[PDB]
């Protein structure tokens, strides 16, 4: 026993799914990205997310191949909604990225902080006191994690 976040609500809350795949803009624009591959496989991520959170009584709100601007535009929407009848809010992002940033489908970048800081208590009081979950799925650098040995577990 201990306090738990109320999760009774009908739709429970929205579950954004910004799913980036076609990165041909970035390639064109941003020089240093001339070779970023398209994110094959996301479809699957979006699907899995969609189902699993549907079954959890959340109202999915997908969006595909979004430039950095589109992403902000989108968050600003849910940032401005009245989540008064909502019990929680989840936002998923699947795209390329770098040290503390996510990549718009055009090469432009958006600090994870900017997106995250959009739904604070002041910025969106209709959510104050309710869980705001974010699942960023992107790279955060170009260093392949190391990995050492040990048989425990």
């Amino acid at each position: 026993l201990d306090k738990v976040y109320q999760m009774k609500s009908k739709p429970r809350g929205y579950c954004l799914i910004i799913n980036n795949h076609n990165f041909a803009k970035a390639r064109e624009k941003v020089p240093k990205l001339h070779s970023i591959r398209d994110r094959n496989g996301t479809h699957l991520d979006a699907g899995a997310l969609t189902t699993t959170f549907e079954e959890l009584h959340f109202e999915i709100k997908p969006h595909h191949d979004c430039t950095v601007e589109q992403i902000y535009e989108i968050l600003k929407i849910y940032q401005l909604m009245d989540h008064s009848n909502m019990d929680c809010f989840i936002c998923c992002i699947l795209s390329h990225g770098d040290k503390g940033i996510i990549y718009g489908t055009d090469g432009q970048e958006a600090p994870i902080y900017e997106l995250t800081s959009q739904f604070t208590g002041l910025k969106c009081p209709s959510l104050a006191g309710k869980p705001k979950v974010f699942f960023i799925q992107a790279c955060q650098g170009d260093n392949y994690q190391k990995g050492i040995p040990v048989e425990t577990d």
Binding site: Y5, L44, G100, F135, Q140, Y144, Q145
Partner: protein, 88 residues
């Protein structure tokens, strides 16, 4: 009525620690998302708090290997929740 800090009740689930890559198999999707969902499915019904599920995802993903560049992937949640977070 009462008061709580501006940034309370947040939960960030990064698919990897900083300056590092995260993997995506065009075949089945990505190590993180796929593993996050899989676990959510098998655990939420039971009653497992999201931190718990998120921990396991840290586990499963840790056992994956990019044999080639002998590399790994380490997800990394960061949270401000003030109550257990479960999904009935």
């Amino acid at each position: 009525t009462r008061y709580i800090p501006d940034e309370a009740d947040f939960l960030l689930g990064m698919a990897t620690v900083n300056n590092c890559v995260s993997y995506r198999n065009p075949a089945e999707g990505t190590w993180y998302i796929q593993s996050l969902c899989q676990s959510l499915r098998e655990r939420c019904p039971r009653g497992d708090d999201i931190l718990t599920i998120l921990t396991e995802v840290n586990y499963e993903v840790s056992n994956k290997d990019d044999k080639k560049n002998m590399g790994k992937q380490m997800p990394q949640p960061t949270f401000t929740l003030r109550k257990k977070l479960v999904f009935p």
